[PDB]
Design a protein around this ligand. Structure first.
Ligand SMILES: O=C(O)C1=C[C@H](O)[C@H](O)[C@H](O[C@H]2[C@H](O)[C@H](O)[C@H](O)O[C@H]2C(=O)O)O1
Ligand SMILES: [Ca+2]
Ligand code: NA
Length: 129
């Protein structure tokens, strides 16, 4: 089981809850961006075999959040590998697994949540599981 370093994080938008808060190891710090279609992009630094993305959701034990995962070598031309809704049943890292493929960049696109239009993520980790 491999956990890859995330060398950089960017995002479409944020409200002062920075993108890099998703890789600080702290469930009390988050990235937040308001509105369906906002996204956050994780850079592995080079192309790696990836088959699993874990995300911990803000208020993750009290609301469900819609999202998709896309990956690839070109941020402008990523491929969607996963689409779903967070469980609403834990604040912990939740695993979203998919057929193994190569990627330098992993993007999470959020569609808001069952309470409001925000996309708020406390932690992300990216694996070859
Ligand atoms: O994910 C959130 O719910 C969230 C993220 C933002 O960082 C901010 O805290 C946001 O707050 C909104 C939200 O609707 C919340 O329910 C409450 O109404 O405050 C407003 C706000 O803009 O402060 O919540
Ligand atoms: Ca955090
Ligand atoms: Na925002």
């Amino acid at each position: 089981h491999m956990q890859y370093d995330i060398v950089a994080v960017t995002a479409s938008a944020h409200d002062g809850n920075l993108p890099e808060n998703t890789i600080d190891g702290n469930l009390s710090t988050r990235w937040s961006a308001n509105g369906s279609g906002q996204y956050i992009t994780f850079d592995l630094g080079s192309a790696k075999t990836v088959n699993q993305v874990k995300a911990a959701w803000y208020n993750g034990d009290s609301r469900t959040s819609g999202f998709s995962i896309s990956l690839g070598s070109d941020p402008a031309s990523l491929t969607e590998v996963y689409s779903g809704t967070s469980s609403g049943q834990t604040n912990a890292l939740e695993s979203y697994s998919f057929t193994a493929t190569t990627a330098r960049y992993i993007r999470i696109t959020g569609f808001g949540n069952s309470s409001n239009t925000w996309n708020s993520i406390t932690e992300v980790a990216i694996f070859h599981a």
